[PDB]
Structure formats: C-alpha cells, structure tokens
Symmetry: D2
C-alpha cells in the first residue's frame, strides 16, 4: 500500500522503522503549516502568489529589520496575492499574517519600539504575534496589554530564545497561545549541543498541552544560495515533523534567498513524507492516555471523532468551527485524517493554520433561514472544496463534527458520512 | 473513590490488582445478564415476580425434563409475571425466554424429539435456543432449519458440551449467534482439570468475535440446599465476569433448590462487584487493537461512542435500536457506561440481554408524525427511564447513538448530551 | 530444535502478543510438562492422621502439613508431628528423590480481647519446642499482633516463618503494615467471608495476592477450595475453577482445610489440587507477568537481587529447564521466585529447615544435600551443582541439551550470591 | 545536614526523563540543565585529508574523541594513503606509554566504487589488496547494490583479509530495495546519504536512513550515519541548528557511528568538528528512551540456545537493575561485546581483549570501550582471567568510569576460546 500504511500497521515502533518504504508515496494532504519570512526576495505580488500555490500558510514580518512603511507594504502585497484566488472559493487558500517582534533588547519589560510595532500590527489586522525573547509569564501579559482592547483575537506565540525562557516554560505556555522554538538566539544563550533537547522537550510539552508549536531558524539555510539543501537540512525538517511540531519556518530562505519558492516547495515535500512516517499507533494511544478526562462536549466529541476516523481510515474530518477551537481539539489527538475546518470567520480561518492538519475553508455565502439547512450547506461546501482539491473521492468516508445550536463552543455531534 | 475507580486508573494490571478496595462500593448497574432455569421451585407466578425484581434477565426451559404442556404453562406464567410490571413504562424490565434442547442423543442428525421441541419453541415465541451438544457447524444449520420459516429470528446459542465441540469451535461460532460453556457435560467428556482452559479460551474467542458467551453449570451449586454459597462458588462467579462472559447461569440452583430468589440475588451481588474490578484500560485497548477496521458506520459509530464515553465517564450510552445490532456493537467494545437500548421491538428488547451491559427499554408510545421528533421523544424516553432507575442524574453526560434515516443498519451519529 | 515442544505446556498461548490472543490460544490438548510450582498445604485431621495414608499424600504432592490448633490437645498434635516426621523420613533412603515436607501450626486466634490469647502463648511455645517451620497466625488485625507472635516464639523461634492470616475487615484495611512485619500472608477466606460480604471476598483475595506478588512475599489461598470433595469423589466445576484461578491470580500456595482433615477423599483432593495447579501454571501469561513484575520491582544495589533478575531473564531467553540455585537461608531462591520464571527454581541447601520453608515460595524445588563439606569450598559448590543436576535427571526436570541457569556466590554464608552461569546438560 | 547527594544523581544524564512511563512523558522530562555524565558511546569516524594529515593535529583529534580514521580512496594515491597510515599509527602509539589510558583507533578504507557499470572496479581491486597489505581494519564498500557485490569485495581481499570488517555503503535505490540480502552478507551498513540523496528524492532520504538503522538495530549489526552532518563547519567555527539536530537525531535513531567527511578532511575546523560531534552525541545518548528501546529490542530478538547471547541479555538486564557503571566483558573476537551492545544498555561495555585488531574494530559497536591487555599470559588460565578482569577495573578507575562503591557486571567464559562466554557476575568496586 501507499502513505506508509504497512509501516503504520506494525505492532512495535522498531517494526514500524523496519517497514518504512521509500517507494510508498504519500497521498494525504500536507499537515505541518509552513511560515515564510517575507523580505525583498518574497515581496512581489507575482512571487507571493507562486509561494501560496507552493503551500505557504503563514507570512512572517520580521520587525527586527524594516520600517513601519516597509511592513505596511509587505502586508498589502501579501493580502493582494491571497485575494487574487478569491474568485474561486472552492480553491481559495487563506494565509495568516504574523508579526515577529524585535525583542525587549536591553533586558527589562517590553521595549518602547515593540509597543509601537504591536499597535501597528493591531491597526493592520495581523493574526499572529511572535513575541521575541519571552522569559516569564509577565512578558506575555505585557504583549497582550500592548495590543489593547482591539487586539483580543490575535494569537500570541512566545518565542523561547534563552535559558530563563526554557526554565520558566510551563508558566509561559499557560499564558501563551503557543510556542516558537527560536533556535537561532537559543543556540547562542545555551550550548549548541543542548538545543535539540530544548526543541524536543518544548514540542512534547506543547503536544501534551494541545497548543501549537513552531520549529524555527536554519531549517533549509543552504537554500538561500543553493538550489538543493544539505542532507542534514532535509533530516532536520523531517525530524521536526516527526517530533510533533505543528509549524515549520523559513527565515532568509524566503526573505533574502535566490530560491524562495523552491524552499517552500522543498519544505512541503519533506513535511508530506514525514507525516506518513508518523507512528500514529503509539502516538494516538499515548496522546489519549495523557489527555485528562473532560466534561466538555467539544473535547469529548473530538476524541470520539478521531477514534471513529482511525477505525474506518476516514479521508477527512469535516468540522464546523467559529473560533477554530473545535479544529484545534481534533488536531491535538493527531489523526491521520485531514481536519477540514469550515468557518465564516476569515481571522479564525487564517489562525487555524497554527494547528497541524487543519485545512481551513471560508464560507462566504450568507446564513440560510433554517440553521439545519445552513449547516448542511457548509458541510457540502467542505465536501465540494475537498473534492476539487483531491482530499476526497466518491465512496470515501468522512467524520462530520457539528453542534446542536448556533454559536461557538456548542460542538457535540460526530456523524459518519459517505462521499457522494 | 467508588466502583473501583482508583483501581481502574492504574497504568499496570499489577497496580490495578493492588488498588482493589473492599470499601469501594459498586455504583453502576449490573451488566452480566442472569439466566435462571425455571423448574418446580420457580414455577410460581408469585415467586417469578420476585426473581424479576431480583434481576433475572433470561428464563431457561430445560427440555431434558418436562412435557410440552408443562413448558407452555411455565412460559404462560413467566409472561404473566413479566407483564405485571408493564403499568410503569419507564421501569418495565423485559425478560427473554430460552429453550434448552435435550440433545442429539444417538447421532445421525438432530434428535426426533428436538425437532418437535424446536417447532414448539417457534410456536410459543421463544427468543433464544440453547442447542445441546453441538459438535460441528452442520449441527447448528440443522437447528436453524428446525426453526422453520417463522423461527428465523430466534437467537441460537450453541452449547459446547464435548471435546469435538471444543476442537471445532471456530466453525461453530461462525454459524452460531453465541456460545454456552456448558461445563456440566463438558467436565465429563474432557478432564475436569482442563475445563477452566476451555472456558477461558471460548470466552476469549467470543469477546474477539463480538458474540455473546454464557458461563453455565454449578456456579452456586451449594445454594440448592444451603442459604449461603461456598468461597469457591463466589470466586467462580466473579471470575466468569472477570473472564468476559456476557451471561451467568443458574440450573438446579433456581429450578429445584430451596433458595431460588436468594441465588439470583447472590449472582447479582457478585456480578456487580466483579464488573467494577474489570481492568477496562487494557481490556478496551486490546479489544480495539484486535477489532478489524470497518467501513460500516454502525461499527465506526460504536468505537467512537465507546471512546467518547470513556473520556468523560458517561453515565450511559443511549442507543436506538431495532434488531439490537447497534447495541451489540457498542457492547463488544466493553464500555464502563451502561448501554441503554431503546427499541420498539419486543423480541429485540428480550434478546439484547445476551449482550453484556445492554439495558433494554420497550418503547410502547405511538409514532409521532415527524420522524426526527419521534427519535428525540424515544431518546428522551431512555433518559427518563435511566434517570428514574438511578442510572442518570441531572448534569451527567450521556453518549447518544442514532441514525440518519429510519430503518435498521443506518446508525451513524454519536452525540454528547448533558442531562436535563 | 524441539519438534513436539512447539505444541506443549501452552507455549503457543504464551507466545501471543496480547492477553486476549493468549486467551484465544489456550489448548485443552496442550498437556503440561513442567513440574507443579504452587505448593499444596494439607490440614491434618482424623482422615489424614494415619502414617500409612500420610505416605500416600506425600507421593500425591503434599508440600506442607497444617496442624489446626483450634481443635486438638497438645498430646493430639504432638502425635500428629511424630506421625508426619515418621512418614517424611520413610523416603530418606533415596536422597535424589527425597521430598521434604514443612510443618505448619495454625493458631486458634486471639478470641475476644486486646492481645494474644493465653492458649496461643502455650501453642506457640509448643511449636517452638517441636521444631515447626511455619506459623499461621489466626486473626491478625495490625502489625502489633505480628510482633506479639514473634515475641511468643522467644530466642529459639527465630527461624520460624510467620504467615499472617487476614481473617477480618481491620486486617484487610491495615494490610500493608501487617505484610511489612510478616513473612507472608494467608487469605483465610473462611472467617473473612463472614466479617465482610461474601461477594467482596474475591476482591480482597485478588488484592492481597497482588500486593504479595509486588512485595515478593509468599501468599496462600485458603478455605473451601475443593469443599464438595469432603463427601464426593469429584469436585464441582466452580471448585476446579477457583483452584485454577488462585494459581492464575499468583498465589504461591493452595490449601485444603477440612477437605483432607475430615473428608472421605483426602489423597484424592491432594491429587486433584496438583492436577489443576499444573494446568493453571502453563496457562500463566508470563510475557506480561514478567514485564510487569520487572517494571514494578525497585532497582537494587544488592547483588543477590541483581543476579536474580539476570538469571530469570537468561532463563526466559533460552527456555531453561531449571534454575539451580545454591542457597543457605532460602533467600536466593525466594528472590528468583518473585520474578515468576517458567523455569523451575531448584534450590540446593544443607539446611533442613530452609528446605522445608522454601515450599512457601512458588516454583521452588528443594533438594537437601546430605554429603559432607569438602576441604575446598571452590570444590564443594561444584559438587553441590552436580547434585541438583542429577536430581533433575532422575525426577524428569532435565534431559540432555536442556540448558540450565546456575546461581552461586563469591564466598560461603548468607547473602553472598552474585554469579549466574549458563550450563548445558550432558 | 542536607544529605541528599543521590538527588544530584537521578537528576543528571536525563535520568528523570529516562524513568518516565511513556515516550511523551520522556520528551516532556528532557532537561537542558541535566548534564550528561556517561562516556560517549556513538563512535566518531573522521575522514583524513590535508587538514587532518599532520601527526601533531591527528594527536589532538585522538584526544578530541576520534575512534575511526577514514581514508577516501576516491581521491589520493597509494603513496599518499600509506603516509596517512604512518602518520595515524604514529600519533596513536604516542599514547601507548600508559596502557590504562591508551585509546586504540581503527583504520577504514572507503573504496572508490564500481564506477560506470556492473562488476568490482579495477582500481578497487588494487585498493582492496593495498588495504589488506597495510593492515586496515574496516572497508567501506562504495555503491553496494546486491549480496553478490559484497562477496566480490570479500573475494578481492583474499585469504589474508579474513578478519577485515566489511561495511556496505548503501548509495542508490537498488541498494535500498535489496537491503536485507546485503545486510545478511555484510558486517554492517553505512547510510551514505551523499550519493543516496541524488539517486532517490532528497525528501525520502530520512526514510531510508531511519529504516536501515532500524533493521541494523534489529539484526545487531553496526550502522554508520554519513555525509554533511556538520557541513557548515568546513568554513565556520560553529554549526547550524539543523546540523546539531541531524547529529543528535542520528544517535537518537540508533546509529552506532557518526561520520565527518570534508568537515575534518579539508575544513578549517577539523578538531572542532570532532569535539562538536562528541558534545552532541554525549547529550543525545542521555536522551535515549532506554525503557522502551530495551523492551522492544528484547521482544524483537529471537530466543537463543547460545550461552554467549543468553549471558548478554542477562547482563544487560542485571546492569539496568542496579544502574551498573559498566559491563566488563572479556573478549577475543569482539563478539561477546557486540552481543551486549545490541541490547543497548545505559552501562558502558568495557571490552578487554589481547587482540589489537578486535580492539580497533569493536569501535563499530555502540557503547563498546576497548582496552588492549598487553601483560603476558599467566601459566594458569584461571588466574589470568581474573587479572584481565581486574585490568578493566583499574582502567575504569583511572579513566573516570569507575568510582569506589559502584557496581559492575562482569562477563566471562568457562574455557579459553571464541564464543565460550557463559558467566555474568555482580562485582562491587574497590
Ligand atoms: C498480578 N499478576 C500475578 C498478574 C497476573 C496476570 C497477568 S496477565 O495475564 O498478563 N493479565 C491478565 C489481566 N489483563 S487485563 O485485565 O488487562 C484483560 C485484558 C484482556 O485483553 C481481556 O480480555 C480481559 C482482561 C481482564 C479484565 C478484567 C479483569 N481481568 C482480566 C492484563 C494481562 C499479569 N500481568 O501483570 N501482572 C499480572
Ligand atoms: C508525542 N510525540 C512527540 C511522539 C512521537 C513519536 C512517538 S513513537 O514514534 O510512537 N515513538 C518513537 C520513540 N519510541 S522509543 O523512544 O521508545 C524507541 C523505540 C524503539 O524501538 C527504537 O528503535 C528507538 C526508540 C528511541 C527513539 C528516540 C529516542 N530514544 C529511543 C517510542 C515510540 C510517540 N509515542 O508517543 N508520543 C510520541
Ligand atoms: O469550534 P467553535 O469555535 O467552538 O464553534 C463551532 C460552532 O459552529 C457550529 O457548528 C455552527 O454554528 P454557527 O451558526 O455559529 O456557525 C456550532 O454549533 C459550534 O458551536
Ligand atoms: O440497531 P439497528 O437494527 O441497526 O436499528 C437502529 C435503527 O433505528 C434508528 O436509530 C431509528 O429509526 P427507526 O426506529 O424508526 O427504525 C435508525 O436510524 C437506525 O438505523
Ligand atoms: O540463600 P542465601 O541466604 O541468600 O545464601 C545463598 C548462599 O549460597 C552460596 O553460594 C553458598 O553458601 P554456603 O557455601 O555457605 O552454603 C553463598 O555465597 C550465598 O551466601
Ligand atoms: O568475544 P569472544 O570471541 O566470544 O571471546 C570470549 C572468550 O574470552 C574468554 O573470557 C577468554 O578467552 P581467551 O583466553 O582465548 O582470550 C573466554 O572464556 C571466552 O570464550
């Protein structure tokens, strides 16, 4: 069979490793979202469109370099390239816009420049903030305050860049929306030979907590100048996916390199192969065993849907979401099935890329008179969207996750549907 | 906590054994159905009513002793005592009627008397047939043929009573509806020291097949004369439940003994305690791992519902059934939650006692004009009944299993309900 | 390779990856070949006082002889000890087939008051004077009760093993403190089934056996195991079930109280208990049992404990017929037993008391070495090795090629075990 | 007063992370402050070239932890490689003054390959005969595609080259497909990712690496991870975040050896790359989840009636039970040490042998620390055995392996000869 299914059927992880096949082509859609740093090499509207077609999910704006005028233009080009595909909603791919802060610099609270960068992001409608150099939970609260009452929906991903941040990780993760393993600065503050330990630990604690985790810095570094990466670069990218990272990131690879689209395509290729090599048998059992009991129907429905999808090898789990939460809760159980999130919120659709295996679609049509009808219309939108994108074929089984009443947090239904 | 919950939380079976508490009272309803052999000591309509209140689920008619007139009278008195409780529809407990055949005696095929006995059972509306001395799959086919065209809906439980029956078990189970470990005759054909091996093997193979299994003969033998059983008798009963038997049975204990109701009450008491001592953590994992993948939504919904019920420690899994199949498929995954089956079929309600943890409700209310309304009215019937019988309290969580259109084999929905 | 050995003593059922597949692979035609591990304790009464009949019970597999001091005078029980030791030493002519038997004293109990009853003090002093090996302390409810029994033994009764009978609710609740100070536990289901609901007795049994297995201390299942056999020649289906399940639960010993003491079939009950125990031992799922027992056992800096886990692991790897261990106090063999190997722990000791007492730990087969000590200890141990090997070649335990694990020490005495060595037979 | 000095232990070398019941819990328990204390297991293979040819710099590489010296026969004349052998052996035997701290180094020959078309290359025949004549210990057979290719290399060595270990470099798709037959006839495998990354898609190389390492771990045969491990260190003093990651992951995957090519052969930081590979490998070994690794390795290993194999599993089990500092094994061929290594113990497998070749070759097995016993054989073998055993104890005492009060597992045999191992004995230090 295909997509490492004989390797996934193995009773032991050693058996699984021995059953890995280079000829077993991956068929599932690429789960681990790609974050591309936008710079001179990736700012043109034609090239940005190419990167979207290549699989860029999030666009990073590094506020360490660049003026507010430069970054406002970065956003416009990004938006314009994304919106050119709006004419065909069944194929429109949303892209999130993230702001990577410059950092507290001198050491104390939040830098004055960062307050001005954060209020700019709020004004320009950014979805995610990569908080540079977070060392404690008070640093996160300061960033949340710097966004104000308008920046409430914006996701805060804390960049762990030093030893203090690693030690105080649990308090930072509790108050953050997710973590970024910013290996660049981290490789300097702590010994370079200990960085993998911090990466693997953070990814593990994030997987345990259900919160997104981003692997960052020098993933395909040689591709800035060369058309093909090193054997260690392909290895690192594949291992970040195998470790359980929700996102993979490109810095100078897409910002100032000669091969921006090629780095995106390469990251996509490796991530797709690594996802099929995931030992879901033990991964799901351990994730389920580790997850505490829940009396929230959204969480209870998530584990039931993931279990049901595993049983029939469901091609996708279509979930109707409003804030992204239902999709995030399905993602935490790491299913082999694609979590197709259908939401009317464009912000939630962009943000849900931080979760692994979540494929957002934006329902652009107005709500129907009968809620039951409007719900079924969105389920069909996700079936039609997944059919033209290759996710679904006729005769496939899908798990459909819905709620009992309109509004966020009412998810409670899982239903087994047969395609067409 | 109560119902061996600290013992169930343990990561290892040894830790589970060490965590068993005598003071941890069981709270869940008694799953393992009790089959009581009706004889002179239990013929009384007055006494039958007491045994129904004591927890008798199935009434066995041993055709080795007794005339057709004697047994048609026993059935008439059983049904009289059962329909006396039909005034309260939320608390009406259905009882199945089983016919235990005399056996092939000599051997050319099915005995001449058995053909008459089987024709009688069909005419008298029996639900289950205990086929005595089954040695091959041809023996089962002969019994099904004997049940003519009318009797095609009677469940056939094959009594494995000899060495040939044990050897040819897999072919017999494939054609049977379930197995009875008839240890009486079995303990004579094969060495008495090897009977436990055959019992444990058959129960294991039946659990793996999802088919019911009955433990029979000398379970509380001393209680025929004495008011209290031996330490080995309580042990055997508890161990049959721990082994994974769907049903426990009383022969002379209830048919000709001085303590018929007391034996039923005692079997109930032991079974309730043994069910709380079940290590569901490994049991469910092994049962799930062993069960093959399925493209049947009834099957897929069952594993999703059982997984969702474990996650929240759901009070009960309310399933709407017609043939009892949906409830049986939930039972095979051995949930801690009570599978409350809500059916309009009187026969299916009686027969569903063969599956462990299935609590049937006969829905006598008239069909509503709108099917979705009728489904919800039936779903609420299960909630009303369980809540009345102590199964449910307000604020509890239940897993509700339904289907997309009316008619059997369309089950595909699992929905997390919060009581009242 | 062993052709018939593939379908043998539930080996296909033991090879299974899951316990459910293990249950499905159990075969009635797979005859057990290994020696019977779970020791049998027979209560000696009027039906079993006869020296002639005692000899039959020894040949039938009785390992320990119980003296119930609830009935009988000191003269009545001293005669029993003489009858027993007489039958015991009748087989001493052939030391290679010499089966030692332990003598246990079951106390009457504290009656109805705080402290050890006055009769119990006399009974315990009697046992010390008569050289009993084990004491079944009736109605133990706390760790102070055990200390009182140990004090009543005095300076002479130091080697005597104290098995605490848990017979009531207080004893069940205070189990961990009682086990810490006891040498082992008896699940005295008779009295226990009265103090706590009869439907909760199996819970207490399974818990105690589990905690004893965890602690490495012996555990005895007692009362009404083959109760119907007091009057009838064959037991009930529930009785064979209970006996088999006690073995499957992990009990080191099975007992016959009243089934041998006053029943028409004393030898037949012993033979039946032996037959069931042998079948149940082959049905043990050693794959998960050993993994769980190893995982649960704490790490140790004691070479006797470290050697035990290494020897049990080595025996599983090659399907060693037996693990021959050279003990002095029965500790090295007890430490091997706690890891529950499929191989027979053949204990070779010069201590007659330790040889009798080592019956309390499951799978331990004691062989009293009567030959005199050689001038060189580095010669003595090597001859003590061959003594145990030839007892297996006589008793059927071993055949040519049947590899064995040999457990010895660096110097002679108590607790200097540190060597495990893989030996090939002939 | 605050007598918890065993709190410092159990908190070092990822011991809290190793004690976890689940692999997720293990990942969550990994600590950057938990310093590794055990000796570095995964052997380092350094490619010798212009940057690493001087005897002076070779001595620093040996002190930095180089275990095997690779001679790439794709570049270089027979005169150049023979001079490299003299410079290497000269630098190695400079430390022979203290046998209790002498570190042996193996010499490997990496062949040029069959070139353009089937059959063993004509240059390779000359190269292989040269290696035999010059006493090489290992041969990295370039571009092995089937079991016949291995047999051709074994034949090309001749009757003299019988002890030489043959590590087959899997460099193409055919080699990956026909892996099981190649491993059966090879002494070990090299995951030569350089050539491999060209023959098969670059995104599928990790799959081939992880599969090969897994099958090698299953078979008990050594496995080497090769090509671009610390590539940026050829020019820069510090590696990339992906390079440290890849090195650590090769160890975590279960590779017995890690390798440096241009990194030491033609780079500006040869010693620094060796020191860096050592640093990462040491940290990655403490992060190994031995709890499931040992259970899976034991479960997967077939039952054996060979006492050498039975003693190995018993010794590894006994070492985990007491957290033995080291497992001292007496070996002649290196087989007893290899069989202990396959079960992947946390204890250091200290191999004591009188064979200089076996001592060099035993570096291919992970966690095997060879010490060459130069003392003369005693008249009675019985005494001589417990003095070679004591040599290992005194060697560990000096080399920081053994502290007083520690426990060691000692693995010996019943008679002098290969494969006669059958004894495991628990010894307390000093
Ligand atoms: C304490 N001692 C002496 C022990 C005895 C037996 C075993 S065992 O045979 O390996 N063991 C049997 C019990 N199961 S299990 O409980 O998870 C269970 C798995 C099923 O698949 C299955 O159908 C039924 C059961 C089951 C359920 C409730 C009570 N009883 C059995 C786990 C596996 C031990 N494992 O570790 N310690 C063990
Ligand atoms: C949540 N995330 C981060 C996870 C990722 C992957 C897996 S997994 O693929 O099932 N997983 C891989 C790691 N092994 S293992 O560590 O026991 C190991 C078993 C071997 O047989 C073997 O050859 C090598 C190893 C091994 C690998 C890395 C470090 N030290 C040892 C266990 C099984 C997870 N299981 O639970 N959580 C998992
Ligand atoms: O995933 P979230 O953010 O909790 O919200 C998902 C919600 O979407 C629905 O499926 C559809 O309802 P809406 O009309 O608000 O879109 C709800 O029933 C469910 O609560
Ligand atoms: O258990 P069964 O035989 O599959 O029957 C359950 C059936 O009953 C329902 O739950 C309700 O419909 P009806 O009771 O009107 O047949 C169906 O949707 C489902 O297919
Ligand atoms: O059973 P124990 O108390 O652990 O002792 C076993 C003893 O066996 C021996 O191998 C032999 O002891 P002896 O020569 O004194 O009989 C000792 O080294 C060890 O102390
Ligand atoms: O590693 P190998 O080839 O199995 O050799 C191990 C051998 O070493 C010894 O300990 C000593 O052997 P030598 O005297 O031949 O060196 C043997 O008893 C054992 O058989």
């Amino acid at each position: 069979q295909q997509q490492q299914l004989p390797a996934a059927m193995a009773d032991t992880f050693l058996e699984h490793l021995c059953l890995l096949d280079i000829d077993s082509e991956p068929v599932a859609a690429r789960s681990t979202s790609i974050i591309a740093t936008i710079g001179p090499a990736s700012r043109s509207v034609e090239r940005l469109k190419e990167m979207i077609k290549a699989g860029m999910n999030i666009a990073r704006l590094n506020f360490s370099h660049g003026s507010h005028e430069y970054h406002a233009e970065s956003i416009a080009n990004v938006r314009e390239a994304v919106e050119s595909f709006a004419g065909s909603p069944l194929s429109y791919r949303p892209v999130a816009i993230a702001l990577d802060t410059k950092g507290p610099g001198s050491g104390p609270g939040l830098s004055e420049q960062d307050v001005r960068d954060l209020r700019f992001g709020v004004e320009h409608g950014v979805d995610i903030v990569f908080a540079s150099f977070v060392r404690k939970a008070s640093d996160v609260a300061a960033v949340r305050a710097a966004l104000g009452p308008e920046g409430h929906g914006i996701k805060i991903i804390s960049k762990i860049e030093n030893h203090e941040g690693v030690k105080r990780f649990d308090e930072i993760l509790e108050v953050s929306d997710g973590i970024m393993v910013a290996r660049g600065d981290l490789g300097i503050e702590i010994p370079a030979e200990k960085v993998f330990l911090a990466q693997k630990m953070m990814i593990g604690r994030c997987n345990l907590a259900g919160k997104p985790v981003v692997c960052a810095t020098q993933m395909l570094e040689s591709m800035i100048t060369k058309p093909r990466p090193t054997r260690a670069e392909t290895s690192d990218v594949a291992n970040a996916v195998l470790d359980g990272a929700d996102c993979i990131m490109l810095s100078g690879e897409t910002a100032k390199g000669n091969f921006p689209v090629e780095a995106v395509k390469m990251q996509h290729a490796i991530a797709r192969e690594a996802e099929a090599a995931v030992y879901h048998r033990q991964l799901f059992e351990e994730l389920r065993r580790a997850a505490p009991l829940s009396r929230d129907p959204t969480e209870v429905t998530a584990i039931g849907a993931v279990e049901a999808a595993f049983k029939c090898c469901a091609a996708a789990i279509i979930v109707l979401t409003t804030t992204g939460r239902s999709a995030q809760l399905l993602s935490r159980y790491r299913p082999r099935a694609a979590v197709i999130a259908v939401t009317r919120s464009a912000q939630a659709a962009r943000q849900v890329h931080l979760c692994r295996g979540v494929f957002p679609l934006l329902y652009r049509e107005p709500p129907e008179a009968i809620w039951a009808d409007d719900v079924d219309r969105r389920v069909q939108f996700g079936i039609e969207s997944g059919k033209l994108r290759g996710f679904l074929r006729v005769g496939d089984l899908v798990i459909v996750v819905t709620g009992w009443r309109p509004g966020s947090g009412y998810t409670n239904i899982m239903r087994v549907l047969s395609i067409s």
